[PDB]
Design a protein around this nucleic acid. Structure first.
Ligand code: ADP
Lengths: 157, 236, 236, 311, 157
RNA sequence: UAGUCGGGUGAUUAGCCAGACUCUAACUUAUUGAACGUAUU
């Protein structure tokens, strides 16, 4: 892989040659898409690593959980320690709670609201428009946790 | 002026006019009536985590009495007042409204019989539109107790009133502003004699060509500018 | 072929002379010295020739200017043609007639010349697929055709900018190759031997912004020559 | 067997051989680049020898109608006739079509076949696929639907002339009423008239007629629409029209030829340039016979005779 | 020196321009109507025009190193609403000053002013018909000769 | 006035001389293929 640049006004350019790197990364990405595989970890730690810790953490829940968040600002020179704190607290919340019950109460609201479906209004979809397939998407997301795939929160922690 | 704020406020007005509160408070009451009868026997688990919407019902009851206790105008009335202020002052604009194109709500106008959006407006029309729209929004929001909120007190300062304006538009930029906002004291500066041809001589303060700042008073011109020739105003 | 290019180049054609110079230079050093050749001297003389007229002003032998501009389905123009003057052209009209649109199209056309002068095969600005195409239209695409004059050796440099509207299966392409060729001539000749480069500037309404020297602006060493093409067609 | 039977009777080959050949026929093309006269390259698709013979036989077998306003790719007509059609006039409106040859598809060909106002040879529905395979070139291997005419082929010129027969007829009919003469060298719509301010409305008529006939497939090149008068240069498909309303090669080309003859006079002209000069002199004799007489007077008759040679 | 001369010649109010280093922030000072004032206390109309002229002069000087007068180089300059923030007195000479300073530049300019048009030849004006919706083609020059004409007559015709 | 046309001179694509024109307004292009001219034939 070659990273090239040329000055302004030169008669001929110097371009990059990143095609083999793109080919290898395409192999990695496609293989991972079809079947989960282990991915390399690229990180850079500069002298900006030494920065103060600002106590509280911004609760931007919804993105520290995805697998590809490990590549977020991975080569910025300073490790995302706030991201680590959010992820660690998220793992603790899923370990101490939300796992002893597991899928026990989440599917119960469907049966409970079946009463409103039958003996309430003629047809109810507005009240039950999300969780019906939200349970299915949670199941197909945690299938990695329950199989030889993405680890459970307790073992990760 | 905050024209983006005006666009957000106008889209809010359009949404609340096409949705209204009488088509939401009754639905909330119906849902509460259905759920309370459903939870009458027991198993209040179907309401403990559904209590959020029941409390949001009381929350919506709040911030709605303020719309009745402060005597604020109806959102449709405010929209109509702002629209008629915009169309009657800007010459090219005929009407203005909001459409749900590809989901997002965006404001469209009518320029010379065509239905371009705001971003397609020329700089001359867009700046004047932004000025009049911001002024109308501020007057409507600050004057809720008037039948016509545009007839309220205030002081508005405009620098280069003829900016980006064709000479044809300069002949009617002062009269339109005075008619739309009768009770505002307008203090303006201009570089064009076409605008001065529509202004009384008593309303003009002039700087002498030989003036380094040692003078003490701004005099009116000797010639009556109102109704005069462009060449005469240019010369004298 | 070499014979035809020699016949055209000895007659005064600049493109043929540059082609001969390139084919000599990229060959063995027996005929390619990168300079001190008949064709390189022909090209640099064509670019650099001039004379001081009776009034004391240097007049280049081969002037560079824009001849025609065609706007097909561009903004409010279904099909418009202009006959830009060699020295000064003035566009007048009411508000919302398309003068700013014409200047914007010309600036977009000149952006390709600027980019290929700065950077070989560089990409200039392109027409917007959201606002530039006429709202009514018949084919949902817009064209901006321009022809440039660079002396009797290059009497026409046709460049066309084309864009298709959002959600159109058939996309129209731009014909920007001659501009790239002319800017390649300029850039190569300049690097081999310093020449005088053309100036392309756009001063739109985005000028008149307040303040000056807002930030230290770490942007590329203003001292170096090719900093004169940085943000030259931005409007401000 | 219709088309294949006639092709076999012409080529003296079996039906099976031709039918097997006409399977990848839209694909049997050799594409190459020729140098442009100023800069760049032009891409041309030329079919193989067997497909070339098949196309020639198909062209000679079936005679598609062509209009008198067309001047390209017919016997006895060419550049001189196209230039002399507008020789005596005062104003011209040279115009061009955008990507003329590659914009013609089998859909256009079959649309023009059915609605042609003149006599059209009858093609059975069974052999339409063979017609498409014979006449049309298929760029892009994966896409079997993209079939276009290739500029440069034994069959492309006549198909292109026929596909514009209705356009030529309607344009000529419209132009004769307003005292405008119209010719087309297969990509160069030339309009000329002695009436001022009459050529302004011609481009709009061309656009509306093209939309009516070919829809969006064929379009005018708006950057190639040129208005000219006796105040400016006037040339039609390479022949300059003088202010004396006569055909000419142009002053610059005449001076170039004079310089070449002068170089030959002192023996400073090599064999390649000598052959080029002989070809240019033959072309000049075709276009400007008086130029040959002027050169005979200026450079003596014996020098010219030795330059052109003897039989 | 070339840039300073261009700035002083084109801009009417500015008589001189220089850089002061004492009070050791670098700042640029001009002379307006005989008063030495800094660059940030300019008005809108003398600062905008000066910005345009200075930028154009800088680019001409930097791109034309082989010319005795770099401002005589060739190029294309687009100006929108040239009369921006200019008093009618300034509009009577902006076109002439620009054409004198940069004689080989092709100026393409839009304006809303008869005062500027009074200094421009009729052949150089491309007008839009007042009753036009975009179907008009191939714009035309006006009939009345604007150069040297009365401003009122230009407004009328 | 430009710009254009091009008859002549010119070791000749340049320079010059004479003449003429002016719809808001040429920008000379592409092969081996097609037709045209020319040469072998
Ligand atoms: N895509 C478009 N389709 C149709 N009309 C448009 C489009 N974009 C802009 N316009 C209209 O064309 C005009 C563009 O204004 P502009 O070019 O800035 O003119 P000016 O400088 O003369 O005021 C306005 O009237 C605007 O409404």
């Amino acid at each position: 892989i070659r990273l090239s640049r040329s000055a302004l006004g030169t008669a001929e350019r110097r371009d990059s040659e990143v095609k083999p790197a793109k080919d290898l990364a395409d192999i990695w990405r496609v293989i991972n898409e079809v079947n989960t595989i282990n991915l390399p970890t690229f990180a850079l730690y500069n002298v900006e690593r030494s920065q103060p810790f600002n106590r509280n953490i911004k609760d931007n829940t919804g993105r520290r959980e995805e697998r590809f968040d490990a590549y977020s600002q991975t080569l910025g020179g300073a490790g995302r320690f706030d991201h680590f704190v959010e992820w660690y607290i998220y793992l603790h919340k899923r370990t101490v709670s939300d796992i002893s019950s597991s899928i026990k109460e989440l599917e119960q609201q469907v049966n409970d609201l079946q009463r409103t479906v039958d003996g309430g209004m003629v047809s109810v979809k507005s009240l039950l428009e999300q969780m019906k397939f939200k349970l299915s998407e949670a199941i197909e997301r945690n299938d990695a946790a329950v199989s030889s795939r993405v680890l459970t929160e307790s073992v990760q922690k | 002026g905050r024209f983006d704020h005006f666009v957000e406020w106008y889209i809010y007005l359009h949404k609340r006019t096409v949705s209204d509160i009488s088509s939401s408070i009754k639905e909330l009451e119906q849902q509460v009536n259905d759920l309370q009868r459903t939870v009458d026997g027991g198993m209040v688990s179907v309401k403990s985590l559904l209590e959020q919407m029941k409390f949001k019902l009381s929350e919506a009851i709040e911030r709605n009495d303020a719309a009745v206790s402060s005597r604020v105008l109806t959102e449709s009335v405010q929209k109509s007042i702002v629209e008629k202020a915009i169309c009657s002052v800007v010459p090219s604009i005929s009407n203005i409204w909001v459409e749900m194109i590809t989901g997002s709500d965006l404001v469209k106008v009518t320029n010379d019989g065509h239905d371009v959006t705001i971003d397609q407006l020329s700089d001359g029309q867009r700046v004047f539109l932004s000025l009049v729209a911001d002024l109308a929004r501020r007057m409507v929001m600050l004057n809720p107790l008037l039948e016509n909120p545009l007839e309220g007190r205030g002081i508005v300062l405009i620098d280069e009133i003829e900016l980006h304006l064709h000479p044809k538009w300069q002949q009617e930029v002062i009269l339109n502003l005075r008619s739309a906002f009768p009770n505002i004291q307008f203090i303006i500066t201009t570089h064009s004699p076409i605008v001065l041809s529509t202004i009384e001589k008593r309303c003009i303060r002039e700087f002498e060509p030989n003036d380094d700042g040692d003078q003490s008073f701004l005099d009116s011109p000797d010639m009556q500018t109102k109704g005069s020739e462009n060449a005469q105003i240019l010369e004298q | 072929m070499t014979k035809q290019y020699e016949r055209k180049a000895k007659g005064g054609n600049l493109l043929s002379a540059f082609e001969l110079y390139q084919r000599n230079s990229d060959k063995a050093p027996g005929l390619g010295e990168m300079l001190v050749g008949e064709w390189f001297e022909m090209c640099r003389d064509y670019i650099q020739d001039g004379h001081v007229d009776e009034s004391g002003i240097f007049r280049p032998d081969n002037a560079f200017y824009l001849r025609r501009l065609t706007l097909k389905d561009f903004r409010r123009f279904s099909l418009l043609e202009i006959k830009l003057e060699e020295d000064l052209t003035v566009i007048i009209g009411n508000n919302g007639k398309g003068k700013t649109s014409i200047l914007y199209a010309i600036a977009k056309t000149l952006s390709w010349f600027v980019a290929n002068i700065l950077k070989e095969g560089g990409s200039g600005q392109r027409l917007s697929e959201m606002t530039d195409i006429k709202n009514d239209a018949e084919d949902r695409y817009s064209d901006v055709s321009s022809t440039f004059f660079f002396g009797k050796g290059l009497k026409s440099v046709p460049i066309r900018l084309s864009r298709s509207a959002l959600g159109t299966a058939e996309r129209r392409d731009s014909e920007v190759k001659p501009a790239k060729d002319l800017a390649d001539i300029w850039r190569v000749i300049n690097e081999v031997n310093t020449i005088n480069l053309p100036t392309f500037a756009l001063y739109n309404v985005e000028r008149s912004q307040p303040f000056n020297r807002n930030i230290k602006d770490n942007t590329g060493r203003r001292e170096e020559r090719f900093d004169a093409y940085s943000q030259t067609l931005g409007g401000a | 067997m219709s088309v294949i039977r006639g092709l076999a009777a012409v080529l003296r080959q079996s039906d099976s051989d031709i039918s097997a050949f006409l399977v990848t026929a839209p694909r049997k093309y050799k594409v190459y680049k020729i140098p442009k006269r100023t800069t760049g390259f032009r891409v041309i698709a030329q079919p193989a020898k067997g497909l070339k013979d098949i196309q020639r036989a198909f062209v000679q077998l079936y005679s598609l109608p062509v209009h008198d306003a067309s001047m390209a790719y017919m016997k006895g007509k060419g550049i001189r006739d196209n230039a002399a059609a507008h020789a005596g006039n005062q104003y011209l409106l040279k115009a061009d079509l955008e990507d003329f040859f590659n914009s013609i598809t089998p859909a256009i060909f079959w649309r023009c076949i059915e609605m042609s106002s003149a006599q059209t040879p009858q093609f059975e529905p069974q052999d339409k696929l063979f017609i498409e395979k014979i006449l049309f070139w298929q760029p892009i291997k994966r896409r079997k639907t993209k079939l276009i005419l290739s500029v440069g082929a034994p069959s492309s010129p006549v198909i292109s002339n026929f596909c514009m027969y209705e356009f030529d007829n309607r344009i000529h009919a419209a132009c004769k009423k307003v005292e405008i003469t119209y010719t087309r060298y297969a990509d160069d719509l030339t309009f000329s008239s002695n009436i001022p301010d009459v050529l302004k409305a011609v481009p709009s008529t061309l656009e509306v007629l093209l939309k009516d006939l070919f829809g969006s497939a064929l379009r005018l090149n708006h950057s190639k629409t040129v208005f000219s008068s006796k105040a400016h240069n006037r040339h039609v498909t390479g022949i300059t029209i003088n202010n004396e309303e006569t055909l000419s090669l142009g002053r610059d080309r005449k001076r170039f030829i004079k310089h070449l003859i002068n170089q030959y006079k002192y023996g400073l002209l090599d064999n390649e340039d000598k052959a080029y000069l002989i070809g240019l002199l033959a072309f000049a004799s075709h276009i400007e016979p008086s130029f040959i007489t002027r050169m005979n007077e200026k450079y003596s008759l014996e020098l010219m005779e030795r330059l052109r040679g003897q039989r």
